[PDB]
Design a protein around this ligand. Sequence first.
Ligand SMILES: Nc1ncnc2c1ncn2[C@@H]1O[C@H](COP(=O)(O)OP(=O)(O)OC[C@@H]2C[C@@H](O)CN2)[C@@H](O)[C@H]1O
Ligand SMILES: [Cl-]
Ligand SMILES: [Mg+2]
Ligand SMILES: [Mg+2]
Length: 361
Amino acid sequence: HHGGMEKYVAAMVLSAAGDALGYYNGKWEFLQDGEKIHRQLAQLGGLDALDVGRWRVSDDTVMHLATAEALVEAGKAPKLTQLYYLLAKHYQDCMEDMDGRAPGGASVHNAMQLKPGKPNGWRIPFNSHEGGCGAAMRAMCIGLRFPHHSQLDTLIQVSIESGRMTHHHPTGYLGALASALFTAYAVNSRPPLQWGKGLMELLPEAKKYIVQSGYFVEENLQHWSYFQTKWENYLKLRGILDGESAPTFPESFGVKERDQFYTSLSYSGWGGSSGHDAPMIAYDAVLAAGDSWKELAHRAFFHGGDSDSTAAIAGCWWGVMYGFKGVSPSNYEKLEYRNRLEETARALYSLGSKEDTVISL
Ligand SMILES: Nc1ncnc2c1ncn2[C@@H]1O[C@H](COP(=O)(O)OP(=O)(O)OC[C@@H]2C[C@@H](O)CN2)[C@@H](O)[C@H]1O
Ligand SMILES: [Cl-]
Ligand SMILES: [Mg+2]
Ligand SMILES: [Mg+2]
């Protein structure tokens, strides 16, 4: 109602529901173990009993809305110069809404360094500690804005530059690429088993952009292999490297096995905390879950890692594909910023549903 638009609304609202559920007002951090989280989940009456009335969204939704609101304000056929001004401004400004929302170090530090308005004032230098998932968690709606094939170059550039406004490390900003790219694939009903291959094919194009852009190319290139290698390895493991083949999951892949797997994906032991593994876990959830919100939630919202970020990503992708089908109303009806999220979604659809261009840098 319209069917196109319904998917956009769900992408935005269920991304935020995911964040809130995966955050639980920071309480999951005192457990930091999927089995312990799943048992506390049971004692709250399970997923369908959860009322998000008092479950605040975290930094993930706040920053996702900032992306979305910037895209919307940029309008039809924007100067990429204006879009980057607006993304910087929205990111910097949204830092005022992080009370009790546990934002990340790179997100905060860098958003506060930006100089929106000044030519190139939204660029920061390369940094070794900037491979967190703070760019990936907020980039999905770039794929809603720019879903058409003709726009791939835009999606690549915008996802990367939105990302490296806070995360100028390929592990960071390629997270944003994957987040946006897969949202675009979901918009276009591209079956999820093809998404990984798609990303592996676009990484050389992302590299060509980073190279022509001319910023810290030496450093960017030298760290480039970590992301790529982790994704190759993961798609190999799941048997979807060829992108024609349905995924293979282990016989034994319950809550406990998922935690250990998420830890093996991680940079330094914390599943989904980085730009490579946050979208990877969301992707793994989406591939297992099909049309089940409960399944997606048990895999992407409730685990011992950065479940808020994995949930934000997975909930967006999943909502694009499946709308609100099978979702308990208590899980989103009183979700913080629901009206705001619906309104931005509608506005993103207006733009996204029209195959326009950008005025280049
Ligand atoms: N170069 C790196 N490669 C892989 N991971 C890295 C790299 N540099 C930093 N990280 C990891 O990224 C994790 C999160 O980074 P931060 O800068 O603290 O957080 P940020 O990415 O801004 O936000 C992450 C959000 C914050 C919460 O919503 C949970 N997820 C850190 O604990 C690091 O372990
Ligand atoms: Cl449950
Ligand atoms: Mg968060
Ligand atoms: Mg205040």
